[PDB]
Amino acid sequence: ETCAIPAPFTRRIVGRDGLCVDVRNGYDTDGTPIQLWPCGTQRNQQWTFYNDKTIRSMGKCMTANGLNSGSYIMITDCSTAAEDATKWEVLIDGSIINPSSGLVMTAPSGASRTTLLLENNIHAASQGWTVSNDVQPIATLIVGYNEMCLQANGENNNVWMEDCDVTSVQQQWALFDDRTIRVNNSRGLCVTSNGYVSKDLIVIRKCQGLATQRWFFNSDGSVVNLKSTRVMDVKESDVSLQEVIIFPATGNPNQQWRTQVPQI
Amino acid sequence: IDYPSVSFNLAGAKSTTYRDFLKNLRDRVATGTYEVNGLPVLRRESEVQVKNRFVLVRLTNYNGDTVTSAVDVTNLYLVAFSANGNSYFFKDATELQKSNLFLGTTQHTLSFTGNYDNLETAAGTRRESIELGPNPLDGAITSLWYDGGVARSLLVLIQMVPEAARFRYIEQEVRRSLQQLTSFTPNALMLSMENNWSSMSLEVQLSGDNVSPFSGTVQLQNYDHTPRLVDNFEELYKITGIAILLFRCVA
Ligand SMILES: *[C@@H]1O[C@H](CO)[C@@H](O[C@@H]2O[C@H](CO)[C@@H](O[C@@H]3O[C@H](CO[C@@H]4O[C@H](CO)[C@@H](O)[C@H](O)[C@@H]4O)[C@@H](O)[C@H](O[C@H]4O[C@H](CO)[C@@H](O)[C@H](O)[C@@H]4O)[C@@H]3O)[C@H](O)[C@H]2NC(C)=O)[C@H](O)[C@H]1NC(C)=O
Numbered sequence: 001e002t003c004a005i006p007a008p009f010t011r012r013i014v015g016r017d018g019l020c021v022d023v024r025n026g027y028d029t030d031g032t033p034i035q036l037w038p039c040g041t042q043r044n045q046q047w048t049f050y051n052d053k054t055i056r057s058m059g060k061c062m063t064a065n066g067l068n069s070g071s072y073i074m075i076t077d078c079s080t081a082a083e084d085a086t087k088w089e090v091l092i093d094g095s096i097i098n099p100s101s102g103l104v105m106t107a108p109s110g111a112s113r114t115t116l117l118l119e120n121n122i123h124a125a126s127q128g129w130t131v132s133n134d135v136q137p138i139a140t141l142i143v144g145y146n147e148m149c150l151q152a153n154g155e156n157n158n159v160w161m162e163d164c165d166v167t168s169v170q171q172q173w174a175l176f177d178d179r180t181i182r183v184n185n186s187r188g189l190c191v192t193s194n195g196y197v198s199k200d201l202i203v204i205r206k207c208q209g210l211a212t213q214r215w216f217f218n219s220d221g222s223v224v225n226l227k228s229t230r231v232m233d234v235k236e237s238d239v240s241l242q243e244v245i246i247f248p249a250t251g252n253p254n255q256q257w258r259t260q261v262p263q264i
Numbered sequence: 265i266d267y268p269s270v271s272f273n274l275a276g277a278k279s280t281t282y283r284d285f286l287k288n289l290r291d292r293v294a295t296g297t298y299e300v301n302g303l304p305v306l307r308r309e310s311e312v313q314v315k316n317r318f319v320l321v322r323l324t325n326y327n328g329d330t331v332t333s334a335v336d337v338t339n340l341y342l343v344a345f346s347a348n349g350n351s352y353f354f355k356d357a358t359e360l361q362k363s364n365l366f367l368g369t370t371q372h373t374l375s376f377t378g379n380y381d382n383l384e385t386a387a388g389t390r391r392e393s394i395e396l397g398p399n400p401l402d403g404a405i406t407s408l409w410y411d412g413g414v415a416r417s418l419l420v421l422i423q424m425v426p427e428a429a430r431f432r433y434i435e436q437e438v439r440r441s442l443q444q445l446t447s448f449t450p451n452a453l454m455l456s457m458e459n460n461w462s463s464m465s466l467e468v469q470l471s472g473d474n475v476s477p478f479s480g481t482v483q484l485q486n487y488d489h490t491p492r493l494v495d496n497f498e499e500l501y502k503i504t505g506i507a508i509l510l511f512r513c514v515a
């Protein structure tokens with residue numbers, strides 16, 4: 001009865017292109033901006049989440065310099081900070097949002113040193129974050145519809161459904177922490193949708209953190225495109241190499257996907 | 265009492281049919297429930313009226329043999345099974361069970377309990393070395409129908425049904441086992457998620473609906489047997505494909 005209150009835990013923040021969120025140069029001085037940087041052990045890269053909805057490194061709370069689109073994030077004293085620029089929420093869809101303003105943490109680019117900011121929630125992949133101590137992406141087999149697998153073929157620009165062969169490098173995907181899906185041995189390529197409308201095809205584009213490349217693996221078995229609320233669908237009509245597209249949720253089998261981790 | 269049923273016939277059974285089976289199974293027990301993060305939490309014991317506490321599963325082997333098992337809707341546990349007029353219950357069998365299950369059948373109490381470790385010892389072998397799949401299942405029914413090697417046989421049923429309903433990862437493995445009639449032994453990861461269902465249930469509930477991170481981490485095994493710890497829902501799901509939650513917290 002009644003969920004016991006958990007103690008403050010320490011984890012890191014993995015986001016765009018796999019980079020970690022860390023305080024610039026490890027300066028614990030109030031006002032220091034928050035930025036991206038390769039994931040290491042450096043204490044300043046560690047964040048402790050308290051029940052007060054506040055996350056803080058080296059004692060200082062993660063604060064939103066301002067509460068409007070464009071304001072940068074930085075650390076500062078919790079006792080003197082604003083009671084809203086210090087409150088954050090971590091959602092399963094991979095969304096880190098500030099309750100009051102409704103703006104979400106964003107990463108304009110995947111280049112380390114990039115200062116993180118508060119922006120309007122457009123569900124782009126630049127707003128996709130995953131907080132955990134395990135900073136690596138999960139390599140897996142994307143099984144679907146007819147026991148076939150999602151296979152990247154040719155010049156890694158197309159994705160067809162073909163008989164599952166675990167050893168086929170073209171059937172191995174890396175579930176990145178920024179909520180994007182990429183080619184295991186070509187993590188620069190992201191599974192992308194050609195649009196936000198039903199029947200819109202699905203191909204392989206360069207990873208740029210667009211709203212067209214942000215996917216959410218719903219617990220119901222479906223994979224959704226947060227921005228369009230459309231899910232991945234397998235064109236039944238096709239005999240072979242059936243293509244995948246984004247179609248309104250229906251519940252049918254060809255909209256079911258099981259991530260079978262081959263390594264973890 | 266008359267409890268709802270879900271049946272699965274091995275004779276000419278496809279991977280799809282199996283999938284449909286595990287579907288009806290979940291619906292039957294996930295009734296009257298509030299869900300967290302999309303996953304339903306089995307009704308507490310003090311909420312399920314006896315009339316809807318157990319669900320009957322009907323599994324038939326290639327030669328027509330039919331064995332029925334009663335699963336507790338509150339924990340998705342297998343509590344007893346009956347075949348050819350006879351029924352069996354584990355040593356810990358609560359009056360509730362015998363009192364309401366398989367009335368009209370010669371009931372029997374077993375010399376062991378339904379623990380993965382108890383079953384394992386009674387069986388004389390460990391889950392890790394037991395084969396699962398179409399044949400093992402078929403041969404498992406026959407064995408129970410003839411009240412022989414009941415222990416080791418129960419381990420096949422358990423992993424191929426309740427567990428499958430729990431973890432979609434298992435559902436897959438088994439599904440593939442039917443699709444190309446072969447056999448497989450559970451790997452380190454599989455058994456790893458089997459033994460931590462409760463922990464996962466705890467972690468998920470504590471954080472509450474939508475909250476992604478876990479206050480604590482779940483210990484899972486990798487194929488090589490290398491320790492692995494998931495600290496966030498998505499991670500847990502993506503890896504296990506969990507479908508049902510066991511009430512532990514209340515949030
Ligand atoms: C998904 O995609 C990722 C990204 O590519 C893959 O991960 C890489 O996998 C490769 C393939 O195994 C890894 O390479 C291995 O590197 C071993 C170490 O080599 C280095 O030696 C120098 C010494 O000068 C060191 O300085 C380096 O730090 C490295 O240690 C290399 O030895 C190994 O070969 C193996 O051969 C036999 C075993 O069969 C042994 O005798 C030998 O010692 C060694 O074990 C590989 O070449 C690479 O490190 C991985 N990179 C990353 C970033 O993860 C995944 O493999 C893909 N997933 C799947 C399922 O394939």
Ligand SMILES: OC[C@H]1O[C@@H](O)[C@H](O)[C@@H](O)[C@H]1O
Nearest residue numbers: 022023024025026037042113
């Ligand atoms: O980009 C500035 C860098 O400064 C370093 O001192 C620090 O260790 C890095 O994590 C990063 O913050």
